[PDB]
């Protein structure tokens, strides 16, 4: 079952040999924006999260779609859980003698996601008009996760996420998360938890409206670290004797969902599903299968099939726990409707029974 998958993986990799220039264009725009933000009193401390890189591709089948995060330090914050959601919080500031320059975004006691996002978009919009060799257009808002979507010439899109950084003990809701103890080790878990966590502007939306000024917890940096340090051996994959298919399985899982979403993007059934769900499911399967020998590259076929099966089980039962926040169900009926899950279930089951033809067809 691995041979067809290997051909797919090779195809997906080769499509990225062309990117070096695209990454260049993204960098040009990003550096430009950061200069303006640094000139702005509110964003003076802003910088890239994925330090050393101007590109990250969240979607495996979208090589022309870039994702960058602009982080902003908040030296001390008090979180207040929004409506028992375990992932959404109001951000307030603690006692701080010196002037805190983010005061301009406050609304009463609470840091306004709306104000910060509004100004973030404002600064960028005025600033992109100062990009002269490259045409950069700001797209209309569709949410707060990407604070800004930029359209660069006719080839490049950049999703920009603004995040607050907090270098303090992770919230209690994360206490039982990051369940890598039996996979990457308990000591690695502890090391990772000495790192900061992030907060992204995000309204806490419900069926009857939304809470405007909430922020959601983000551990994207840890997710990256795990994927690139997925072994308990660590140099797993730096040598053939330890070549595993974890990374391959994730690309294929992401690719399966992305291909199906692309296939049916017009019927809208799959709009609420994302690579983050796939990636979360993947980490759970890795947790269930902590030994590198359960991911032998030779078993790509069955490893991927088993990954698919787990994802299907999550869809059918409407349950996918956030890897860092176990009480946060990414697949709750409140976030994703059953119709979408039944549709995806059937499409995946069709694909799996036919050796995943959607992988070749476009």
């Amino acid at each position: 079952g691995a041979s067809k998958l290997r051909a797919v993986l090779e195809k997906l990799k080769l499509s990225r040999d062309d990117i070096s220039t695209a990454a260049g264009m993204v960098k040009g725009v990003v550096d430009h924006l950061l200069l303006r933000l640094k000139c702005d009193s509110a964003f003076r401390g802003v910088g890239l999260l994925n330090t050393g890189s101007y590109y990250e591709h969240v979607k495996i089948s979208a090589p022309n779609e870039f994702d960058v995060m602009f982080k902003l330090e908040v030296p001390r914050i008090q979180l207040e859980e929004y409506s028992n959601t375990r992932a959404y919080y109001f951000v307030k500031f603690k006692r701080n003698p010196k002037e805190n320059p983010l005061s301009q975004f406050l609304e009463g006691e609470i840091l306004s996601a709306s104000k910060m996002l509004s100004k973030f978009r404002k600064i960028i919009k005025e600033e992109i008009n100062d990009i002269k060799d490259t045409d950069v257009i700001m797209k209309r808002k569709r949410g707060g996760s990407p604070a800004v979507t930029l359209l660069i010439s006719e080839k490049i899109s950049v999703d920009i996420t603004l995040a607050l950084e907090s270098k303090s003990s992770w919230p209690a809701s994360t206490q039982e998360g990051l369940r890598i103890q039996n996979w990457l080790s308990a000591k690695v878990r502890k090391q990772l938890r000495l790192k900061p966590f992030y907060l992204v502007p995000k309204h806490a939306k419900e069926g009857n409206g939304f809470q405007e000024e909430t922020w959601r917890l983000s551990f994207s940096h840890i997710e990256k670290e795990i994927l690139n340090n997925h072994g308990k051996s660590e140099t797993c994959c730096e040598n053939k004797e330890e070549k595993c298919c974890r990374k391959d399985c994730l690309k294929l899982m992401k690719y399966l969902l992305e291909q199906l979403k692309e296939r049916f993007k017009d019927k809208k059934h799959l709009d609420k599903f994302s690579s983050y769900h796939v990636k979360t499911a993947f980490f759970h399967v890795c947790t269930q299968n902590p030994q590198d020998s359960q991911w032998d590259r030779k078993d790509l076929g069955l490893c991927f099939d088993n990954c698919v099966t787990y994802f299907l089980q999550c869809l059918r039962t409407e349950k996918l726990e956030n890897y860092f926040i176990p009480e946060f169900n990414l697949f709750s009926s409140n976030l994703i409707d059953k119709r979408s899950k039944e549709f995806l279930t059937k499409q995946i089951e069709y694909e799996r029974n036919n050796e995943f033809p959607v992988f070749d067809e476009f």
Binding site: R95, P97, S168, S169, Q175, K190, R193
Partner: protein, 94 residues
């Protein structure tokens, strides 16, 4: 072989609320004990004086509150007042 009192046990607990995953050295603990006794004495000392100055035999929550304001700077004093005011408000309501 004498029971010796300290705040080591209480300091640990506070540490857990602010930083659940961290510990503290025996020296840092010794320092925190010196710290608590220093602040305690000052507040109790000033509260004593306020009671004396205003011709009283009793220290109440006010002498403590006023003592806090005089001893602590800026907002630090304020938050201490807010927390104290509350703890009493609740204590007498519980």
């Amino acid at each position: 072989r004498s029971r010796k009192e300290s705040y080591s046990v209480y300091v640990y607990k506070v540490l857990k609320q602010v930083h659940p995953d961290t510990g503290i050295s025996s020296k840092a603990m010794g320092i925190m004990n010196s710290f608590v006794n220093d602040i305690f004495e000052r507040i109790a000392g000033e509260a004593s004086r306020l009671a004396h100055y205003n011709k009283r035999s009793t220290i109440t929550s006010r002498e403590i509150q006023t003592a806090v304001r005089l001893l602590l700077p800026g907002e630090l004093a304020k938050h201490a007042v807010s927390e104290g005011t509350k703890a009493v408000t609740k204590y007498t309501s519980a």
